[PDB]
């Protein structure tokens, strides 16, 4: 388990596009959807399946409004020309027993430039833009004391709360179904295709076997679905013959045995 927060703000947004969006991540899949056009976060209803009455959605709303005010404040101090993208990685992870380790990272135009030093409680970087934004965020002078407690007494609290409130929604387990096929290619060659449908943990290892000997890993392709299930696919270029010999062995946490798949 590792709680993460993906915050993203832009300078000049498109019409119909929000200028600020937050996505929360309890491990592999999303549980939060916040935007600047509405003013509140909405769940996906697959974690607690229960209405938390006004002490879970009236606090995250105010915290993300504070983060929205800070990130929209953090575009006026830059005198550059082009558009901006201020991404932020804010979260924590649980240790052995207690004393969770948080993580605060910031990036402008796809490159990391500053973090948040917890010992001195101050945003710190190397660039002049880093010092400018870090100096502008302490002009509000009541925000560093809020992030210093948000990453050390609110996020581990929410992490230990979602540790045992939704334990049935942390034990996701389905066996992935294989459809191993092939396709013709350039004269003399062919391309195999090993797929993997609707497996819930992200870890999956694929490999190719000619008869009983390994032939490589191929090219890994991975993608989430719109409900939490994950899809994988891989391919390998082989000769025009030998296509009746390949038996791609797949192992996964939802399978108790490396099930051999025949075309």
């Amino acid at each position: 388990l590792s709680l993460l927060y993906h915050l993203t703000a832009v300078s000049s947004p498109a019409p119909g596009t929000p200028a600020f969006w937050v996505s929360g991540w309890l491990g592999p899949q999303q549980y939060l959807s916040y935007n600047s056009l509405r003013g509140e976060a909405e769940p996906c209803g697959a974690w607690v399946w229960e209405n938390q009455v006004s002490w879970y959605w009236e606090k995250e709303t105010t915290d993300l409004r504070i983060k929205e005010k800070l990130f929209l404040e953090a575009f006026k101090a830059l005198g550059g020309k082009g558009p901006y993208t201020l991404q932020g990685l804010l979260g924590c992870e649980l240790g052995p027993d207690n004393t969770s380790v948080p993580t605060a990272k910031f990036a402008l135009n796809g490159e990391e430039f500053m973090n948040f030093d917890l010992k001195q409680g101050t945003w710190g970087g190397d660039w002049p833009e880093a010092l400018a934004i870090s100096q502008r965020w302490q002009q509000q002078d009541k925000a560093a004391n809020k992030e210093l407690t948000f990453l050390l007494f609110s996020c581990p609290h929410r992490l230990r709360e979602h540790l045992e409130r939704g334990r049935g929604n942390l034990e996701w387990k389905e066996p992935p179904s294989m459809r191993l096929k092939a396709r013709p290619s350039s004269p003399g060659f062919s391309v195999l295709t090993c797929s993997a449908f609707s497996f819930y943990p992200p870890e999956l290892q694929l490999r190719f076997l000619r008869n009983g000997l390994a032939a490589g890993t191929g090219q890994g392709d991975f993608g989430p679905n719109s409900d939490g299930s994950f899809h994988a696919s891989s391919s390998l270029t082989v000769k025009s013959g030998d296509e009746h010999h390949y038996c791609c062995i797949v192992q996964h946490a939802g399978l108790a045995q490396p099930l051999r798949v025949e075309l």
Partner: protein, 252 residues
């Protein structure tokens, strides 16, 4: 007669015949740093007489509707010969200045300019909380012009003549060493300004020492047959310049 003044520095000489006086700072003449007030532990670079000469800035045109101009001399002289190159290879620097403003007309013209040198003239932005770019504070060559109303541009200095870009009354701004160019009597303005800072030596690209401002209080006005183009020329000379901390070429 005390109307004729001939100031000679380096290999350059300015001779005027309708001068007024010379305001020399706050009574203090520019001099080198003493051995008691020194901080660094190496010999300063006192280069030559080729860095203490009169360099002539670009001229501006003063119409009837003109409002003012402002320069930034530790950034304006970054390309003026060996005074500029010694800025690029060194870290520190210390110099006083002598500023001579030429503005000529005939006896048929009327108008009056105020020539001030304001130390630590921190400029306010046009918008409330936006950041000011470096090209709108200083330019090197031809200066930035005051506006007549509430200026509001993207990432720009607030340009108001009744606030002078700082938020103070412009009539009370004559507490600094100042002169007047009155076309009834005067032809030029000479101001000698020593080094005014809380440190003995400071960087010359990062810190702006002072700001010249030429503001017309009595506006330019003339007949239907007089000369129309009245230029204003600024000629500045460093004095007692010294440098410290030699390294590679700095930031332009």
């Amino acid at each position: 007669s005390d109307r004729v003044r001939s100031i000679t520095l380096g290999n350059s000489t300015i001779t005027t015949q309708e001068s007024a006086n010379v305001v020399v700072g706050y009574g203090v003449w520019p001099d080198y740093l003493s051995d008691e007030e020194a901080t660094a532990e190496d010999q300063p670079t006192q280069p030559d007489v080729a860095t203490c000469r009169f360099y002539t800035l670009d001229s501006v045109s003063w119409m009837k509707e003109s409002q003012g101009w402002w320069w930034k001399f530790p950034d304006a002289l970054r390309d003026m010969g060996l005074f500029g190159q010694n800025m690029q290879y060194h870290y520190l620097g210390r110099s006083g200045y002598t500023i001579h403003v030429q503005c000529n007309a005939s006896k048929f013209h009327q108008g009056c300019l105020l020539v001030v040198c304001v130390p630590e003239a921190e400029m306010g932005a046009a918008n409330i909380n936006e950041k000011i770019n470096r090209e709108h504070l200083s330019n090197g060559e031809v200066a930035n012009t005051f506006s007549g109303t509430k200026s509001s541009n993207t990432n720009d200095v607030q340009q108001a003549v009744f606030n002078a870009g700082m938020g103070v009354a412009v009539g009370n701004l004559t507490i600094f060493p100042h002169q007047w160019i009155n076309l009834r009597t005067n032809n030029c303005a000479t101001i000698v300004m020593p080094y005014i800072n809380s440190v003995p030596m400071d960087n010359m690209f990062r810190h702006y020492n002072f700001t010249l401002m030429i503001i017309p209080f009595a506006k330019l006005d003339y007949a239907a047959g007089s000369s129309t183009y009245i230029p204003i020329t600024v000629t500045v000379a460093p004095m007692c310049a010294e440098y410290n901390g030699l390294r590679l070429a700095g930031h332009q």
